């Protein structure tokens, strides 16, 4: 019984996780929407 | 370390495993949007 996760996942979350620690946002879930929106929008 | 971080990171990953989205970044926007609006 073996599965895996796509490449990018852990690094994707690492980037999110890093900025959480730096900025210490009051609401983690909304910070996520914002953080990831920028990623989506950056192209 | 903020409370609720580990739980958050795990929940996302688990949904990525269940649903196998093609775009992880965009699925993240949606997954976390659904989380914030779920209350």
């Amino acid at each position: 019984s073996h599965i895996q996760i796509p490449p990018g996942l852990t690094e994707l979350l690492q980037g999110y996780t890093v900025e959480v620690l730096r900025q210490q946002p009051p609401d983690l879930v909304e910070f996520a929407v914002e953080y990831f929106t920028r990623l989506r929008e950056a192209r | 370390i903020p409370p609720g971080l580990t739980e958050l990171l795990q929940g996302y990953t688990v949904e990525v495993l269940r649903q196998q989205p093609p775009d992880l970044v965009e699925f993240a926007v949606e997954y976390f949007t659904r989380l914030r609006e779920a209350r």
Binding site: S1, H2, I3, Q4, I5, L9, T10, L13, Q14, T17, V18, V20, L21, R22 | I1, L5, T6, L9, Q10, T13, V14, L17, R18
Partner: peptide, 28 residues
């Protein structure tokens, strides 16, 4: 900031590790 990047790496690694464990023990 270097210790911050290393810390985040572990938390993710831990969250993913448990996300895999959860999904395997959820399917079967």
């Amino acid at each position: 900031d270097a210790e911050l990047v290393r810390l985040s790496k572990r938390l993710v690694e831990n969250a993913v590790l448990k996300a895999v464990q959860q999904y395997l023990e959820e399917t079967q």
